[PDB]
């Protein structure tokens, strides 16, 4: 029965490892989730420079 | 014509008027119903089944 319990645990671990292999393959194929294969690009600096150019339009003058 | 000359900086200031034509609508924020979603902070996080499941560790 210890062999039965260890075989059940190892078979469920093998099934979860196979399932996470298909999940990681489908995640890296389409780049869908933010966690693993997502290469993050931000538009923060473009918005910062556009906001700064918007404040600089008010300060033009004499 | 009884017109006086304006000052030296009359036309160089900001001029405010009332316009007959209506103003153009501000652009709506772009919508992305299929974005790149992440794990939300209110998502429940139970402990992992069988630990790491990576090379006999748990």
From TrEMBL, chain A:
Protein name stated in the entry: NADH dehydrogenase [ubiquinone] 1 beta subcomplex subunit 5, mitochondrial
Shown part of the complete sequence: 125 to 186 of 186
Function: Accessory subunit of the mitochondrial membrane respiratory chain NADH dehydrogenase (Complex I), that is believed not to be involved in catalysis. Complex I functions in the transfer of electrons from NADH to the respiratory chain. The immediate electron acceptor for the enzyme is believed to be ubiquinone.
Annotated compartments: Mitochondrion inner membrane
Family: Belongs to the complex I NDUFB5 subunit family.
Subunit and partners: Complex I is composed of 45 different subunits.
TrEMBL record, chain B:
Ranges of biased composition (kind: Basic and acidic residues): 22-31
Compartments where found: Mitochondrion inner membrane
Domain of life: Eukaryota
Location of the region described as Disordered in the Swiss-Prot/TrEMBL record: 22-50
Family named by the database record: Belongs to the complex I NDUFA8 subunit family.
Task performed by this protein: Accessory subunit of the mitochondrial membrane respiratory chain NADH dehydrogenase (Complex I), that is believed not to be involved in catalysis. Complex I functions in the transfer of electrons from NADH to the respiratory chain. The immediate electron acceptor for the enzyme is believed to be ubiquinone.
Official protein name in the record: NADH dehydrogenase [ubiquinone] 1 alpha subcomplex subunit 8
Taxonomic source organism: Drosophila melanogaster (Fruit fly)
Lineage: Eukaryota, Metazoa, Ecdysozoa, Arthropoda, Hexapoda
């Amino acid at each position: 029965e210890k062999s039965l319990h260890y075989l059940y645990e190892e078979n469920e671990k093998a099934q979860i490892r196979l399932l996470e292999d298909e999940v990681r393959r489908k995640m890296s194929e389409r780049n869908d989730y933010q966690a693993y294969y997502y290469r993050p690009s931000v538009a923060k600096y473009h918005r910062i420079s556009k906001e700064a150019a918007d404040e600089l339009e008010a300060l033009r003058g004499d | 014509f009884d017109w006086d000359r304006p000052s030296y900086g009359y036309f160089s200031r900001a001029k405010v008027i009332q316009s007959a034509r209506e103003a153009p609508k501000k652009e709506e924020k772009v919508s992305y119903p299929d974005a790149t979603p992440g794990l939300p902070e209110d998502y429940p996080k139970p402990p992992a089944k069988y630990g790491s499941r990576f090379h006999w560790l748990e």
